[PDB]
Design a binder for this molecule. Structure first.
Ligand SMILES: O=C(O)CNC(=O)C(=O)O
Ligand SMILES: [Mg+2]
Ligand code: NI
Ligand SMILES: [Zn+2]
Length: 331
């Protein structure tokens, strides 16, 4: 069995290997990359996402979100307070202001220490889930707006034609912006490209050990667990690496820098934080190996998780028994 310790693997495809996206995902899996839940892909030196980032300041962040924490430094939840719209240029200036800018630090490890010590005492502002793309239309390799769609994959694998679409989303981050512990909708893959700016640190639990993280989370967040048998789908709970180590939960960590891709694999729980002003693009995708995970994915039916239109068909076809309850939670 490849990669039996479930380490995060880093790949360096050549320009020729970068042509066929599906093939390269299946190659990474042949080497055991999915066992970690997360892999890093460094593009060949000849590749670029677009020519420059000099003209993105007029993109609108319609609903910036202030991430307010509650709890203790290593075990907290966050809620998102809506703020007035602002452009990317306005947000960049805000991120770089004295109130929000990255503090002085020695290296990534020191900054990670500072994040876990101090995150809860501040409320950073995040642009999230902004439909759009920064890939040039002429970029033919690993262009996150030109991937094979999940609806087409389900049709190819299972024969059923379904409604829905699959487009990418932009994220604008700042120091301490935080992504809570979660798997993807319907335990899909994700891919994330860091277009510009400061890094993103990731934490990940191997898919084979995801239920260990869920059990800890039910212990640490006991009211939330009583409210919903899949409350991590709310995407609000944080647990630090120190707490995970104290409780014997298997995980790994890695820092993504600008110009790098990260792939998350089905049922790989992940969380993390941004180091400073940055812009990322991400999208969900499927492969044939996903189908079995989609069929078994938990679902939130309490009303909290609310998700895209296109998840309807996935639940309806892959999880017909759960469909009526889940749709009630959508309405
Ligand atoms: O840019 C981001 O914070 C969100 N990314 C993830 O959880 C992911 O791509 O799966
Ligand atoms: Mg612009
Ligand atoms: Ni994710
Ligand atoms: Zn719920």
């Amino acid at each position: 069995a490849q990669n039996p310790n479930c380490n995060i693997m880093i790949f360096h495809p050549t320009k020729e290997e970068f042509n066929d996206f599906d093939k390269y995902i299946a190659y990474m899996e042949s080497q055991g990359a999915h066992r970690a839940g997360l892999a890093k892909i460094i593009p060949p030196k000849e590749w670029k996402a677009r020519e420059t980032y000099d003209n993105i300041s007029e993109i609108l962040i319609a609903t910036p979100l202030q991430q307010v924490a509650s709890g203790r430094a290593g075990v907290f939840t966050q809620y998102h307070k809506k703020k007035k719209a602002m452009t990317v240029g306005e947000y960049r200036h805000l991120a770089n202001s004295k109130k929000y800018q990255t503090p002085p630090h020695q290296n990534f490890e020191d900054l990670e220490r500072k994040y876990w010590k101090n995150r809860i005492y501040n409320s950073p502002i995040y642009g999230a889930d902004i439909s759009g793309s920064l890939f040039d239309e002429n970029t033919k390799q690993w262009n996150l707006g030109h991937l094979g769609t999940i609806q087409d994959l389900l049709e190819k694998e299972c024969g059923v034609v379904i409604e829905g679409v699959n487009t990418p989303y932009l994220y604008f981050g700042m120091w301490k912006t935080t992504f809570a512990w979660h798997t993807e909708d319907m335990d899909l893959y994700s891919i994330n490209y860091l277009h510009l700016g400061e890094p993103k640190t990731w934490y990940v639990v191997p898919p084979e050990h995801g239920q260990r993280l869920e059990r800890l989370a039910r212990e640490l967040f006991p009211g939330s667990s009583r409210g919903c048998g899949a409350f991590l789908r709310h995407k609000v709970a944080l647990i630090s690496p120190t707490v995970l180590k104290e409780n014997g939960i298997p995980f790994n960590r890695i820092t993504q820098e600008a110009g790098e891709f990260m792939v998350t694999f089905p049922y790989g729980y992940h969380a993390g934080f941004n180091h400073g002003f940055n812009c990322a693009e991400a999208i969900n995708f499927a492969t044939p190996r996903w189908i079995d995970y989609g069929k078994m994915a938990s679902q939130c039916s309490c009303g909290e998780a609310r998700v895209t239109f296109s998840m309807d068909a996935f639940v309806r076809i892959l999880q017909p028994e759960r469909y009526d309850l889940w749709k009630r939670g959508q309405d």
